[PDB]
Design a binder for these strands. Structure first.
Length: 160
RNA sequence: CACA
């Protein structure tokens, strides 16, 4: 499931209490403890919708000890293969236009809308190959359209 | 992005 979070760009004295207070103030419940390492941490949310809420609310936006936090789906290294999630999609972007961007980097095996509270849309995309998804991640992340900047990240590819 |  996609309820696991990676928390990146942490300060050298950020501790579980700091992170606990960040997630409390944004009213994100968590299902377990914060595991804080050197410069990064992990936490579980109760389900997928809360995890996405935390990403959309905190990642690139919340500053802790004067550093912007990265909050992203935790993805094991070896499971960064065909699958990506695209965030910050313009609310009225026709799917055909989105598709015309995706296919510039490979064959789309599936593109699923992820229902969300935000104004912006979210899709999960499976390319046919690791190389295609890498290219799409590199070229779509940061792309500006209709006054929004796409955010693209890996999600676990557990079957490739 | 976790591994003595």
């Amino acid at each position: 499931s996609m309820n696991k979070l990676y928390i990146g760009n942490l300060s050298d004295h950020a501790g579980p209490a700091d992170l606990e207070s960040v997630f409390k103030d944004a009213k994100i419940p968590v299902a377990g403890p914060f595991l804080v390492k050197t410069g990064y941490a992990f936490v579980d949310c109760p389900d997928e919708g809360w995890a996405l809420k935390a990403i959309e609310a905190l990642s690139g936006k919340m500053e802790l000890h004067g550093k912007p936090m990265e909050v992203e789906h935790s993805v094991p290294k070896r499971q960064r293969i065909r699958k990506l999630q695209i965030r910050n999609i313009p609310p009225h972007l026709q799917w055909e236009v989105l598709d015309s961007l995706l296919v510039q980097y490979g064959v789309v095996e599936s593109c699923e809308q992820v229902n969300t509270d935000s104004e912006t849309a979210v899709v999960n995309v499976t390319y046919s190959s690791k190389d295609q998804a890498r290219q799409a991640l590199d070229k779509l992340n940061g792309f500006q359209l209709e006054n929004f900047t796409l955010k693209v990240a890996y999600i676990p590819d557990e079957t490739a």
